[PDB]
């Protein structure tokens, strides 16, 4: 139980939560839930038109 630690589930959750955190910070700083990025391609169509 020493050459590695099975606690990398915590690391995966940290990475995922940090990604969602960056997306949320971008949403709040831009004011668009459908970000100018790829998100919600159908919403992107609707918003562009």
């Amino acid at each position: 139980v020493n050459t590695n630690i099975a606690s990398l589930n915590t690391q995966r959750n940290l990475n995922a939560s940090s990604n969602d955190l960056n997306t949320s910070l971008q949403r709040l700083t831009t004011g668009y839930r459908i970000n100018s990025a790829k998100d919600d391609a159908a919403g992107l169509q609707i918003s562009n038109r």
Binding site: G31, R33, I46
Partner: protein
């Protein structure tokens, strides 16, 4: 314009709580790593 708002304007009454929750998970994960990385140290230093 109201349609563009309803489709694009973030209803940040939820994204603010989501930001708070995500910060909670980030701090919790940092603390969990800090707590778990000490398990092998303790078990090896005490068992040997």
């Amino acid at each position: 314009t109201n349609a563009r708002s309803r489709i694009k304007d973030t209803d940040f009454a939820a994204e603010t709580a989501a930001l708070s929750k995500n910060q909670v998970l980030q701090q919790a994960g940092t603390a969990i790593l800090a707590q778990a990385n000490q398990l092998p140290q303790a078990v090896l230093s005490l068992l040997r």
